[PDB]
Amino acid sequence: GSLVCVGTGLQLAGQISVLSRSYIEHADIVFSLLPDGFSQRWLTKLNPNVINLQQFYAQNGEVKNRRDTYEQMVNAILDAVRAGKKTVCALYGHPGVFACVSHMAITRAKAEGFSAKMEPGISAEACLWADLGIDPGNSGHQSFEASQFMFFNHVPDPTTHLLLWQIAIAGEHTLTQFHTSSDRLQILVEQLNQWYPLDHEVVIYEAANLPIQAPRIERLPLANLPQAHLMPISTLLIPPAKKLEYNYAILAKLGIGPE
Amino acid sequence: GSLVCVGTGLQLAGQISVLSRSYIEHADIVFSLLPDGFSQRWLTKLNPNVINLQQFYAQNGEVKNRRDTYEQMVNAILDAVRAGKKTVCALYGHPGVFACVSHMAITRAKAEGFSAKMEPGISAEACLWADLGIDPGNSGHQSFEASQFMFFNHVPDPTTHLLLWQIAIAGEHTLTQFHTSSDRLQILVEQLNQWYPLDHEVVIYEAANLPIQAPRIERLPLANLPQAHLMPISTLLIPPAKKLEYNYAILAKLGIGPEDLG
Amino acid sequence: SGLSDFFTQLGQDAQLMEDYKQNPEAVMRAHGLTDEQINAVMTGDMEKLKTL
Amino acid sequence: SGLSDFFTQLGQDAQLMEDYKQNPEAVMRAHGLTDEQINAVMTGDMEKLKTL
Ligand SMILES: C[S@@+](CC[C@H](N)C(=O)[O-])C[C@H]1O[C@@H](n2cnc3c(N)ncnc32)[C@H](O)[C@@H]1O
Numbered sequence: 009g010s011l012v013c014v015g016t017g018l019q020l021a022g023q024i025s026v027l028s029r030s031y032i033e034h035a036d037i038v039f040s041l042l043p044d045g046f047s048q049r050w051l052t053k054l055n056p057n058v059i060n061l062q063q064f065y066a067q068n069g070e071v072k073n074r075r076d077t078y079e080q081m082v083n084a085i086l087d088a089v090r091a092g093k094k095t096v097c098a099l100y101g102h103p104g105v106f107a108c109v110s111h112m113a114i115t116r117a118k119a120e121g122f123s124a125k126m127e128p129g130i131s132a133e134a135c136l137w138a139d140l141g142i143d144p145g146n147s148g149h150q151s152f153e154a155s156q157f158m159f160f161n162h163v164p165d166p167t168t169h170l171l172l173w174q175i176a177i178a179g180e181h182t183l184t185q186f187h188t189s190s191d192r193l194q195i196l197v198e199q200l201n202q203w204y205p206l207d208h209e210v211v212i213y214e215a216a217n218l219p220i221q222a223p224r225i226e227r228l229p230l231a232n233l234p235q236a237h238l239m240p241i242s243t244l245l246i247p248p249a250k251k252l253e254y255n256y257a258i259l260a261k262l263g264i265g266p267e
Numbered sequence: 268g269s270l271v272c273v274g275t276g277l278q279l280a281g282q283i284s285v286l287s288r289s290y291i292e293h294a295d296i297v298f299s300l301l302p303d304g305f306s307q308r309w310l311t312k313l314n315p316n317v318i319n320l321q322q323f324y325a326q327n328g329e330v331k332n333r334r335d336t337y338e339q340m341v342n343a344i345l346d347a348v349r350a351g352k353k354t355v356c357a358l359y360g361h362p363g364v365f366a367c368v369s370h371m372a373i374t375r376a377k378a379e380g381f382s383a384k385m386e387p388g389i390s391a392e393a394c395l396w397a398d399l400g401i402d403p404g405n406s407g408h409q410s411f412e413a414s415q416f417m418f419f420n421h422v423p424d425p426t427t428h429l430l431l432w433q434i435a436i437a438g439e440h441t442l443t444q445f446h447t448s449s450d451r452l453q454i455l456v457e458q459l460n461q462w463y464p465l466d467h468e469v470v471i472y473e474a475a476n477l478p479i480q481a482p483r484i485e486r487l488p489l490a491n492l493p494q495a496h497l498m499p500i501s502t503l504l505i506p507p508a509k510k511l512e513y514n515y516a517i518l519a520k521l522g523i524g525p526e527d528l529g
Numbered sequence: 530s531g532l533s534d535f536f537t538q539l540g541q542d543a544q545l546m547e548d549y550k551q552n553p554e555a556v557m558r559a560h561g562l563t564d565e566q567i568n569a570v571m572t573g574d575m576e577k578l579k580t581l
Numbered sequence: 582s583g584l585s586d587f588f589t590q591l592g593q594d595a596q597l598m599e600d601y602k603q604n605p606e607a608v609m610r611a612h613g614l615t616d617e618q619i620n621a622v623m624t625g626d627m628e629k630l631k632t633l
């Protein structure tokens with residue numbers, strides 16, 4: 009058996025790479041994690057032998073640690089590989105961006121002596137740059153998971169574009185809920201206020217998943233984040249609060265200046 | 268006329284999105300910036316009406332500000348749009364990542380009242396996560412242009428995966444050269460030593476452009492960077508210098524401790 | 530029904546995408562979408578579309 | 582022509598890609614690559630490939 013993890017991008021049908029589509033077509037079996045029923049139907053038409061990973065999320069109001077869901081997904085995938093199947097895992101976006109299942113499955117497959125690889129796809133941030141007309145290289149880019157930003161020591165560079173992923177579950181420490189609370193978001197606001205003014209304009213971004221759908225590009229002051237309507241798919245963009253300043257020490261060593 | 272800018276990804280033929288391929292197929296005219304002759308031939312077979320933007324680069328040993336090249340590229344694209352053509356720009360990777368020609372053309376097209384949009388593609392960074400088996404979310408991710416990192420005060424978070432793009436021209440201020448010098452790279456090494464030990468392992472990464480080609484994944488100590496063979500396509504990956512540590516301040520505000528984390 | 534078929538086609542066909550962007554309602558009607566479905570598209574009600 | 586045609590197909594066809602991965606030399610030989618072309622591939626010399 010063998011494993012190839014591919015991404016389907018965010019938009020229905022057209023945002024998958026040509027080669028990745030081919031991998032799905034030729035697979036013995038496909039394990040999917042897709043945004044909606046339209047993408048699910050598209051996939052099943054491409055290859056009918058699909059196992060929907062969604063089943064491993066908490067189903068009936070059960071309390072379930074997300075780590076357990078992911079482990080069960082990985083085990084499902086590996087079972088197909090172990091049994092001898094040419095296995096493809098088709099995840100929305102890029103299968104290795106803010107996604108542990110593919111990396112975990114690839115690590116485990118290799119450890120067990122199976123061929124395993126990841127094909128890149130178009131991620132949410134790839135969509136953001138295009139939709140907002142922002143180049144990550146303009147003043148730089150930084151990405152963190154929102155909860156990780158809260159629970160561990162991270163320092164943003166406020167001259168860059170900062171992305172906080174999984175904002176809808178920011179500070180939800182149990183990994184057992186699909187949303188957080190306004191109180192937690194307020195703590196995040198106060199934390200961010202170390203670098204960003206309370207009136208600093210931030211952007212709640214949601215890339216469209218359907219061709220008839222416009223992206224969500226909602227501008228609001230940071231202070232208002234705790235009252236905002238957030239979805240699992242929301243990413244928070246925090247544009248620069250500070251202009252670039254000259255690195256005089258290095259400029260002098262290079263023998264140059266602003267001019 | 269109208270403008271759509273698409274990316275072709277890094278790998279030949281297969282890394283373009285289905286929709287982006289369709290845009291190229293149906294275009295009146297295509298302006299291209301592709302990695303090699305194989306991709307150029309692939310494009311021409313998709314749509315024979317191609318103008319190669321590479322022509323606007325300094326051909327001779329002439330000195331030419333890259334900003335001037337970009338201006339001429341943008342002007343060529345807009346001339347087609349203004350004339351009435353359904354115009355597509357096909358750029359390698361993602362057309363809006365560490366790339367200015369598409370953003371500029373789109374801005375100008377919109378200002379002149381033309382429909383203009385950018386379609387995301389697969390960037391070098393996207394390829395890196397896959398090839399190295401690294402998730403940007405694992406401990407965070409920062410990306411900077413190498414020269415901008417040197418010229419301006421950027422402050423890395425050494426728990427993250429740090430990418431320095433355009434490492435081969437690090438510190439080259441004129442924008443008239445294809446590469447920098449050892450001296451400039453040594454200055455960068457000393458700068459980075461603020462946060463990273465000299466023996467810190469860094470990675471020179473080059474995504475493959477052909478299906479029969481392996482990526483470059485060259486691991487070396489930071490100290491050795493100035494002696495490295497760098498190419499225009501090289502990206503420098505600086506893995507974390509430090510493990511994640513608990514933010515007791517914020518945990519306290521949340522009313523929890525480390526043991527409570529799921 | 531026709532919703533899924535239409536959205537899949539539109540998503541991967543640049544000619545149809547361009548036609549759609551020129552005249553959304555006409556293209557949707559040409560693909561048999563109901564007035565209710567078209568209204569959901571134009572008001573950006575993704576939840577309604579999913580139920581339809 | 583042949584070299585380019587092969588690389589273009591290999592790059593987008595997952596069946597051919599998997600066949601190639603299983604037996605690079607056999608697949609390259611069968612698609613008409615010369616010994617010198619195959620050598621360049623196996624030694625990873627992209628410059629020589631382009632010349633060819
Ligand atoms: C488990 S990660 C999935 C990321 C996915 N692998 C990718 O390539 O974008 C989930 C997070 O990705 C981001 N995300 C997912 N879908 C998104 C969308 N449609 N628009 C914006 N961000 C999105 C959000 O930060 C969300 O909380």
Ligand SMILES: C[S@@+](CC[C@H](N)C(=O)[O-])C[C@H]1O[C@@H](n2cnc3c(N)ncnc32)[C@H](O)[C@@H]1O
Nearest residue numbers: 360361364365390391432433473474500501502
């Ligand atoms: C002008 S930017 C173009 C980036 C391109 N738009 C993308 O999406 O990757 C050029 C820089 O991108 C990166 N890059 C381009 N091709 C690459 C490759 N094959 N492997 C790694 N990095 C690459 C390098 O940092 C290089 O200096």
